[PDB]
Amino acid sequence: LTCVTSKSIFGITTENCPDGQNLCFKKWYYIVPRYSDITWGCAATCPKPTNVRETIRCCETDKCNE
């Protein structure tokens, strides 16, 4: 399984995930109305928002987390 792990206006980077990590994630962390930090990666289980600023989505196919 191949996930996005970083993105810019110039393109994406991807990784082929560790064995046993069969989900891709995208995670938004809200900082101010105009701006949110966003991270992307492989995961074993769908990360749980531990903060109210956090929004996560997960999926199971190649590069699905863009």
Numbering used by the authors: 1 to 66
What do the study's own words say?
Despite high primary structure identity, often greater than 55%, muscarinic and adrenergic toxins exhibit distinct pharmacological profiles and clear functional differences. “Loop grafting” has been used to construct seven chimeric toxins to dissect how the affinity, selectivity and functionality for the muscarinic and adrenergic receptors depend on shuffling loops between various toxins.
On the other hand, the mode of interaction of MT1 with muscarinic receptors is less precisely defined, but its selectivity profile for M1 and M4 receptors has been clearly established (review in,). Another invariable is that the backbone conformation of loop 2 is well conserved between MT7 and MT1, although the sequence is not. MT1 superimposition onto MT7 by least-squares fit shows large deviations in both the loops and in the sequence-conserved disulphide-bridged scaffold leading to important differences when the main chain atoms are compared (rmsd MT1 vs MT7 = 3.22±0.01 Å, depending on the molecule in the asymmetric unit that are compared). A better match can be obtained by not matching consecutive residues but only the secondary-structure elements. Secondary-structure matching (SSM) for the MT1/MT7 comparison leads to a value of around 1.34 Å where the matched residues have a reduced sequence identity of only 66%. The affinity of MT7 for hM4 is very low (pKi: 4.87±0.06), approximately 40-fold less than that of MT1 (pKi: 6.50±0.04). Equilibrium binding experiments with [3H]-Prazosin show that MT1 and MT7 toxins interact with α1A-adrenoceptor with relatively high (pKi: 7.21±0.16) and very low affinity (pKi >4.7), respectively.
